[model samples]
Target: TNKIKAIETDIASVRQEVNTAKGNISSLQGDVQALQEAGYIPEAPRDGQAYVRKDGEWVLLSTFLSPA
Candidate 1:
């Protein structure tokens, strides 16, 4: 029972983190949509992958070369 209680608490913390990360992703996605409507940048090549957000910043995930 004690081990189960500990695991339940850990799962709750992880769930909170997952929700926060999802919210951050959603907010950054809104920015990406706005930029698309403004057409302020050149279009990427046909092979270019879509933009993405991580660690609170929006970036071209396709160009990310390292795991760090």
Candidate 2:
């Protein structure tokens, strides 16, 4: 019983990190979706940095860093 409890406690910390990564990426996606809905920007590209169009140029909005 002690071994079972110990192993589970160790894995529980891992799950916390797992969920946080999931959540942060999820929120990022939601924010992009919101911007698209409001027409503040166009559809996001398949890259880390998100950009908005401005007078024939690009305006950076999202900075993709830190692995999810």
Q: For candidate 1, write residues 1-68 as lDDT tens digits.
A: 59999999999999999999999999999999998888455445456567665554457765667665
Candidate 2 Cα misplacement greater than 4 A, ranges: 1-3, 40-68
Estimated TM-score for each candidate: 0.56, 0.42
Q: List per-prediction Cα lDDT, in the order shown.
A: 0.78, 0.77
Q: Which stretches of candidate 1 lie over 4 Å from their true place?
A: 41-68
Report lDDT (Cα) of residue 15, candidate 2: 96
- Tens-digit lDDT string for candidate 2 (1-68): 58999899989999999999999999999999988888554465667777867675565654324333
Best by TM-score: 1
